[PDB]
Motif scaffolding. Structure first.
Motif, PDB file in Angstrom:
ATOM      1  N   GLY A  74     -12.161  -1.144 -13.911  1.00  0.00           N
ATOM      2  CA  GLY A  74     -13.052  -1.667 -12.886  1.00  0.00           C
ATOM      3  C   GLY A  74     -12.400  -2.518 -11.812  1.00  0.00           C
ATOM      4  O   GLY A  74     -13.012  -2.777 -10.765  1.00  0.00           O
ATOM      5  N   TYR A  75     -11.159  -2.939 -12.070  1.00  0.00           N
ATOM      6  CA  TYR A  75     -10.406  -3.863 -11.215  1.00  0.00           C
ATOM      7  C   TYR A  75      -9.095  -4.145 -11.953  1.00  0.00           C
ATOM      8  O   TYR A  75      -8.987  -3.860 -13.144  1.00  0.00           O
ATOM      9  CB  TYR A  75     -11.166  -5.182 -11.054  1.00  0.00           C
ATOM     10  CG  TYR A  75     -11.402  -5.878 -12.376  1.00  0.00           C
ATOM     11  CD1 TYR A  75     -12.546  -5.619 -13.120  1.00  0.00           C
ATOM     12  CD2 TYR A  75     -10.456  -6.745 -12.910  1.00  0.00           C
ATOM     13  CE1 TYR A  75     -12.740  -6.191 -14.355  1.00  0.00           C
ATOM     14  CE2 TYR A  75     -10.647  -7.325 -14.154  1.00  0.00           C
ATOM     15  CZ  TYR A  75     -11.790  -7.040 -14.871  1.00  0.00           C
ATOM     16  OH  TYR A  75     -11.985  -7.587 -16.122  1.00  0.00           O
ATOM     17  N   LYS A  93      -7.353   1.570 -22.076  1.00  0.00           N
ATOM     18  CA  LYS A  93      -6.157   2.026 -21.381  1.00  0.00           C
ATOM     19  C   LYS A  93      -5.928   1.197 -20.114  1.00  0.00           C
ATOM     20  O   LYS A  93      -4.786   0.955 -19.712  1.00  0.00           O
ATOM     21  CB  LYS A  93      -6.326   3.504 -21.015  1.00  0.00           C
ATOM     22  CG  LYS A  93      -5.046   4.275 -20.752  1.00  0.00           C
ATOM     23  CD  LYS A  93      -5.302   5.765 -20.964  1.00  0.00           C
ATOM     24  CE  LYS A  93      -4.134   6.630 -20.540  1.00  0.00           C
ATOM     25  NZ  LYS A  93      -4.242   7.035 -19.110  1.00  0.00           N
ATOM     26  N   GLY A  94      -7.022   0.766 -19.491  1.00  0.00           N
ATOM     27  CA  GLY A  94      -6.930  -0.025 -18.276  1.00  0.00           C
ATOM     28  C   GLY A  94      -6.282  -1.361 -18.571  1.00  0.00           C
ATOM     29  O   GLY A  94      -5.325  -1.753 -17.910  1.00  0.00           O
ATOM     30  N   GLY A  98       0.764  -1.249   0.000  1.00  0.00           N
ATOM     31  CA  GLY A  98       0.000   0.000   0.000  1.00  0.00           C
ATOM     32  C   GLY A  98       0.797   1.304   0.000  1.00  0.00           C
ATOM     33  O   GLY A  98       1.955   1.321  -0.409  1.00  0.00           O
ATOM     34  N   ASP A  99       0.171   2.387   0.473  1.00  0.00           N
ATOM     35  CA  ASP A  99       0.754   3.741   0.474  1.00  0.00           C
ATOM     36  C   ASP A  99       2.000   3.897   1.354  1.00  0.00           C
ATOM     37  O   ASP A  99       2.782   4.830   1.182  1.00  0.00           O
ATOM     38  CB  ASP A  99      -0.273   4.769   0.963  1.00  0.00           C
ATOM     39  CG  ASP A  99      -1.640   4.583   0.341  1.00  0.00           C
ATOM     40  OD1 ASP A  99      -1.822   4.962  -0.834  1.00  0.00           O
ATOM     41  OD2 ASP A  99      -2.544   4.060   1.032  1.00  0.00           O
ATOM     42  N   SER A 100       2.168   3.016   2.324  1.00  0.00           N
ATOM     43  CA  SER A 100       3.259   3.183   3.275  1.00  0.00           C
ATOM     44  C   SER A 100       4.389   2.230   2.961  1.00  0.00           C
ATOM     45  O   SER A 100       5.208   1.938   3.827  1.00  0.00           O
ATOM     46  CB  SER A 100       2.771   2.929   4.703  1.00  0.00           C
ATOM     47  OG  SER A 100       1.646   3.733   4.989  1.00  0.00           O
ATOM     48  N   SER A 124      -1.214   2.877  -8.826  1.00  0.00           N
ATOM     49  CA  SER A 124      -1.556   2.258 -10.100  1.00  0.00           C
ATOM     50  C   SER A 124      -2.788   1.355 -10.015  1.00  0.00           C
ATOM     51  O   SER A 124      -3.603   1.315 -10.934  1.00  0.00           O
ATOM     52  CB  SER A 124      -0.354   1.481 -10.634  1.00  0.00           C
ATOM     53  OG  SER A 124       0.299   0.807  -9.576  1.00  0.00           O
ATOM     54  N   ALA A 125      -2.940   0.643  -8.910  1.00  0.00           N
ATOM     55  CA  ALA A 125      -4.115  -0.200  -8.728  1.00  0.00           C
ATOM     56  C   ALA A 125      -5.383   0.655  -8.800  1.00  0.00           C
ATOM     57  O   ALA A 125      -6.338   0.323  -9.511  1.00  0.00           O
ATOM     58  CB  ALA A 125      -4.038  -0.916  -7.381  1.00  0.00           C
ATOM     59  N   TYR A 126      -5.371   1.761  -8.062  1.00  0.00           N
ATOM     60  CA  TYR A 126      -6.472   2.720  -8.055  1.00  0.00           C
ATOM     61  C   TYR A 126      -6.732   3.305  -9.454  1.00  0.00           C
ATOM     62  O   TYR A 126      -7.885   3.501  -9.843  1.00  0.00           O
ATOM     63  CB  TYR A 126      -6.154   3.830  -7.041  1.00  0.00           C
ATOM     64  CG  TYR A 126      -6.951   5.109  -7.186  1.00  0.00           C
ATOM     65  CD1 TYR A 126      -6.357   6.267  -7.688  1.00  0.00           C
ATOM     66  CD2 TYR A 126      -8.283   5.171  -6.801  1.00  0.00           C
ATOM     67  CE1 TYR A 126      -7.074   7.456  -7.803  1.00  0.00           C
ATOM     68  CE2 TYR A 126      -9.008   6.356  -6.909  1.00  0.00           C
ATOM     69  CZ  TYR A 126      -8.400   7.494  -7.412  1.00  0.00           C
ATOM     70  OH  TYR A 126      -9.121   8.670  -7.527  1.00  0.00           O
ATOM     71  N   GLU A 127      -5.666   3.561 -10.212  1.00  0.00           N
ATOM     72  CA  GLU A 127      -5.796   4.113 -11.556  1.00  0.00           C
ATOM     73  C   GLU A 127      -6.383   3.105 -12.547  1.00  0.00           C
ATOM     74  O   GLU A 127      -7.216   3.463 -13.389  1.00  0.00           O
ATOM     75  CB  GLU A 127      -4.436   4.600 -12.068  1.00  0.00           C
ATOM     76  CG  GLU A 127      -3.863   5.775 -11.299  1.00  0.00           C
ATOM     77  CD  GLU A 127      -4.761   7.005 -11.345  1.00  0.00           C
ATOM     78  OE1 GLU A 127      -4.726   7.794 -10.370  1.00  0.00           O
ATOM     79  OE2 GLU A 127      -5.493   7.181 -12.351  1.00  0.00           O
TER      80      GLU A 127
END
Ligand SMILES: COc1cc(OC[C@@H](O)CO)c(Cl)cc1NC(=O)CSc1ccc(C(=O)O)cn1
Ligand SMILES: COc1cc(OC[C@@H](O)CO)c(Cl)cc1NC(=O)CSc1ccc(C(=O)O)cn1
Ligand SMILES: COc1cc(OC[C@@H](O)CO)c(Cl)cc1NC(=O)CSc1ccc(C(=O)O)cn1
Ligand SMILES: COc1cc(OC[C@@H](O)CO)c(Cl)cc1NC(=O)CSc1ccc(C(=O)O)cn1
Ligand SMILES: O=C(O)COc1cc(F)cc(-c2ccc(C(=O)O)cn2)c1
Ligand SMILES: O=C(O)COc1cc(F)cc(-c2ccc(C(=O)O)cn2)c1
Ligand SMILES: O=C(O)COc1cc(F)cc(-c2ccc(C(=O)O)cn2)c1
Ligand SMILES: O=C(O)COc1cc(F)cc(-c2ccc(C(=O)O)cn2)c1
Lengths: 324, 324, 331, 328
Positions: B238-239, C58-59, B186-188, B229-232
């Motif tokens: 969608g996943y 793009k995904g 994650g972020d940390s 990147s996962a979030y993007e």
């Protein structure tokens, strides 16, 4: 602390019990061809090489180890002592002698096989040594193993050659040309004409003279050329290697991965195909994690059937002499 | 006589036990990408799928089966009942469901994990469900397994992402770019700037401001871009599936082939790196047939160590609030 | 001096031309299953994706890219614009309209024809020499349509046709016989779907004819009911859609196998859909699955399976039906 | 009438052009090993072998051809005439002759290349060349000079297998796979090659920083010896089996994969490095190179100590001193 301990903290007392181990007996031209085909196909997590030629044996080991970066088989070991082969799933026999012979190869198998069964009680045996149908019988008797666990490479390679040669005449890949060479390995093997096809199209039905003397296309010579091709390649480079090695790895694949593919290989077929002797003939066999578990009953012509029976009596006669 | 019995003679009446079985729990987008990746890498001789969505489970199964001709994994099974996963070497968890969103994930594991260990007492556990470090701790507690046999994917994908992006800046393949993201997924997570290199050339030495706010080249944003990147991708499609799938399959390859390769995955690291709690963090791990047997001890800066220490305490803080 | 230039000394100015580039048109379930299978069999040095859904496109691209470390396909690209597919050896079409409520199946095909009328000319413009592999259903018809629109010689326009159903048939076959599908042989030919023809006379293991051993094989009076195995094949897509809402993994592996025969000039024989007007007794401009030798030039030869009278009759009827729908279409 | 015609309807004429053809020059122990490795990694849709020993050549081609069922490389051809090599994307040279002197040995190898390389070039103008014959650093230079090729297209396997041998021994001492161990041998192939002690690591953890004695003679664990072991392991194997094969063929195959797939992986290979690493003469030395469909496209500039740079300089002098005395 030593540099290894500076970099690496050990968290587990590591028990090395090999899980998909394979031994090649003999590091001749054939033995190493099998070894490298197997290594390139990622079939083992461990490979052992055994031989009585110790320097040769050490070299081949080192030479293989040196390509680890490039392989996915983490452990390679060698030795004249069979403890190195302990816990093999599959042991492939390429060992043989350099007059009529077989009794010496018998003598060689008299030392090797018990050494093998000793260190790998539950392994499958794949004999490649010639004469393959006899030595396979020999290995089977000495081993005490049930028949499903003792395989001869038999007509596997010759079937691959025949399909290659078929593909050249037809202009399509050997994968798409189907044809079976069964029976005694070598000169008396059987080209099963009725089974040759592309896409389920029988050639014998399309062209009834297929494989006969009147055959204007001389397909009988295709079988002839497969029965010779070994001798002819030996004449050219001194031995054969690459093709036999590739055909053996194909067999290891079906064994290791329990594929249950069908291959023309030599199995103990007493009770089938009208055979009443303890002998090994090549028939289409289902090959999996338990060795040969099933055999396809091919529909043969009456002379094809008499031909198989003749091979049985031939091999047996030769077997009747030998002593273990 | 049934046609099968006309065609095939059964020479052996044998039983089951798969030698290299892998299970995937959960047949959503991630679990399935793990399966197809595993199936195309020939890592198993049997694949089990388990989930509670019975239709989806059966559909995904049959779909995989219809592709046998093209695969070398002869047996694919599925079911809601966990007997179907008996005797797995490796079991890959991708099952999952405020911030009792963990507790519900905990209650899921409370059901799945005891079921898993019942049918495969000796399996390695590979947890992928997020939040992965906590969820790997949970399956460890519930399973009873020793720590070497419970593995979280942790930072393995994010390191590969890191190495891909690196190779974009430098114009070489990721295979050749080296760099590690460790610690809390994650972020940390920690980008270990000092380890980054191509062919043993320290990037941070050629360029001391590497990773800093002063970095004109802004390599810090590279790590930020990994962590996002996962979030993007979720934002766009969608996943995520394919990359995590390929990443898990590469872990499975180290396990199944006992490669003893080093991967950044989450391990129970109490007693190392200054950590005194029962928590899982990604550190460079030696991974083989016995799971994680060794850990590389990375030379961290005091700032990097305290950062790992903080991750330990917030993880332990979360775990304390769970009911088992 | 930038870190890259401090580390890496450039010696060549690169003008990048892809040598084994494959394009997949369509990043739906089927398109991506094709993509990943192809990626993992290392069949191309460059993969390109096109669709009209830009975020989705793009995904998928980024997701595959993040897997780069575990692959051997160094460049993956995507975009709505077809310049990204320039210089492909193989272009695989999985694009289609999904039906409505609503619209007749003829009007659904027409909308697909409207999709192909935009796509195929874009494809042909940027990879003039590519091979086309059409997967979209109804495949025989949409492959004919792609053929017509592209202006390619027929050898270079292929339909996936009965390729997957034959693999299914072999699998179901190996389940009955206890043998791996690889060793089981049997062909579904002709029209993709309900009207496909299970060629009973060619089924075999080890070159042993099942039909000869079992003369009831695939008849109504057959006590083992092997015909039902065909029906299982015909229904299996439906059955799978009922369970999971679509199919992917199987169709994807079977396409990649076709891709491998093409990229590697293998000349293996596959059951795939081709223009066979003039062969197999067919008088019309239609595509039907027969066994085709498949290689770097596409379909170079076809095997002439000996068919029964009734089987010739099923093909010719399937030929009439396709030609009939093909006439109703606006190009 | 014919059976083929009965079974098969022909729809397309032959325009047969290889798309990913590889030629291996020489079918000795090394050539064949390269060949079977390339064949088992599916890098080519056509393989071509060439040599002067015509029987052995036809025999080797034939053996490979009998394994076709188990391969996905549909065409394998061979012959004494280099027309069989035409339109190679990659051409691997393993040819060579065995008190003679370094110099007289080199010159006869040079005489072989004067026949071979121009034939390779006449038939595959655009190929990449990859030399393996020893001394490789010199014979890659001869290959470059003779071919008239731009340097990016002439590659010597150089220290690639030795770097791999080094990571293997590293791995054995450390208890981890060679894939996860990193170390770089550069410079002149063989005993004058330099083990770059400051690059050696696992997981980016610098071994030299942990163990500052690493490399030196003040070292209790004699890590310096691992490089000697590598440098020596070649003839140790030759001592035991007469020659080596499997490892060099695997290493070459890995190089071919980077070229054929345009991977742009970094390998320790020998490249014309006049201008870089402080080298003034026209000389080939192993440096990390990025390797793709156009050969060597970039070179990673490693940070070398003063002594390490001195070694490369001295090698470059020895190399040039030799080439200066050759007859082209
Ligand atoms: C000549 O005897 C052998 C040949 C072999 O393969 C040779 C070659 O294919 C691979 O290098 C291998 Cl592995 C082993 C052996 N020998 C043995 O186990 C010991 S027992 C034994 C028995 C009879 C004989 C004989 O009559 O020559 C020789 N050795
Ligand atoms: C929602 O519960 C589950 C999700 C899963 O994966 C989801 C997805 O990733 C794959 O489709 C899988 Cl495999 C299994 C389960 N469920 C179970 O075993 C039974 S136990 C259980 C406990 C709490 C809950 C809940 O709070 O929703 C649901 N099920
Ligand atoms: C809706 O039309 C399309 C579907 C596609 O695939 C969807 C799915 O199979 C994979 O994601 C792809 Cl790639 C492209 C398009 N569309 C186009 O090029 C532009 S032309 C066109 C023609 C008729 C229609 C229509 O009737 O909906 C839509 N677009
Ligand atoms: C000895 O000359 C050769 C060795 C080779 O490889 C040997 C070994 O690596 C594989 O068997 C190969 Cl491919 C080719 C050749 N020879 C040639 O082209 C013709 S030109 C030539 C010039 C001088 C000499 C000499 O010094 O005896 C030999 N050949
Ligand atoms: O390799 C050695 O060390 C001894 O020689 C062997 C050993 C063996 F185990 C099989 C063959 C063998 C088998 C079949 C053919 C042929 O069919 O081309 C050729 N050779 C030869
Ligand atoms: O797919 C399912 O069935 C449920 O969702 C999951 C399950 C799982 F086990 C891992 C991830 C996961 C983990 C990491 C990343 C990311 O880093 O791209 C994305 N997703 C997601
Ligand atoms: O996935 C999308 O993007 C749209 O749907 C498609 C597209 C396509 F190009 C082929 C199939 C297809 C083809 C055959 C079968 C079946 O035989 O299971 C199922 N689906 C489905
Ligand atoms: O095999 C033949 O045909 C002639 O001999 C050759 C040819 C060649 F092109 C490379 C080597 C070579 C190079 C390096 C090593 C070693 O480092 O193990 C061993 N052998 C040997």
């Amino acid at each position: 602390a030593a540099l290894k301990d500076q970099l690496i903290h050990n968290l587990l007392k590591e028990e090395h019990v090999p899980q998909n181990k394979i031994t090649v007996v003999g590091v001749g031209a054939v033995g190493m061809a099998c070894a490298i085909s197997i290594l390139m196909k990622d079939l083992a997590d461990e490979l052992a090489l055994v031989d009585v030629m110790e320097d040769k044996l050490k070299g081949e080991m080192m030479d293989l180890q040196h390509g680890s970066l490039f392989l996915r088989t983490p452990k390679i070991v060698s030795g004249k002592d069979y403890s190195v082969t302990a816990n093999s799933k599959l042991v492939i026999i390429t060992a043989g002698a350099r007059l009529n012979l077989v009794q010496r190869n018998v003598n060689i198998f008299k030392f090797i096989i018990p050494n093998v069964v000793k260190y790998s009680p539950h392994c499958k045996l794949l004999v490649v040594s010639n004469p393959v149908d006899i030595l396979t019988y020999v290995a089977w008797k000495i081993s005490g193993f049930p028949k499903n666990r003792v395989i001869g490479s038999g007509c596997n390679l010759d079937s691959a050659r025949f399909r290659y040669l078929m593909g050249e005449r037809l202009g399509v890949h050997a994968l798409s040309c189907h044809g079976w060479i069964l029976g005694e390995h070598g000169d008396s093997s059987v080209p099963v004409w009725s089974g040759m096809n592309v896409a389920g199209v029988s050639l014998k039905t399309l062209h009834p003279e297929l494989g006969t003397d009147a055959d204007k296309e001389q397909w009988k010579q295709v079988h002839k050329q497969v029965v010779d091709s070994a001798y002819e390649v030996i004449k050219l480079k001194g031995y054969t290697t690459w093709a036999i090695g590739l055909s053996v790895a194909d067999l290891a694949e079906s064994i290791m991965k329990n594929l249950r593919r069908v291959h023309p290989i030599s199995t103990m077929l007493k009770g089938l195909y009208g055979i009443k002797e303890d002998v090994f003939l090549s028939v289409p066999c289902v090959l999996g994690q338990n060795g040969i578990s099933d055999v396809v009953k091919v529909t043969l012509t009456s002379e094809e059937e008499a031909h198989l029976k003749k091979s049985a009596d031939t091999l047996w006669g030769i077997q009747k002499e030998l002593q273990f």
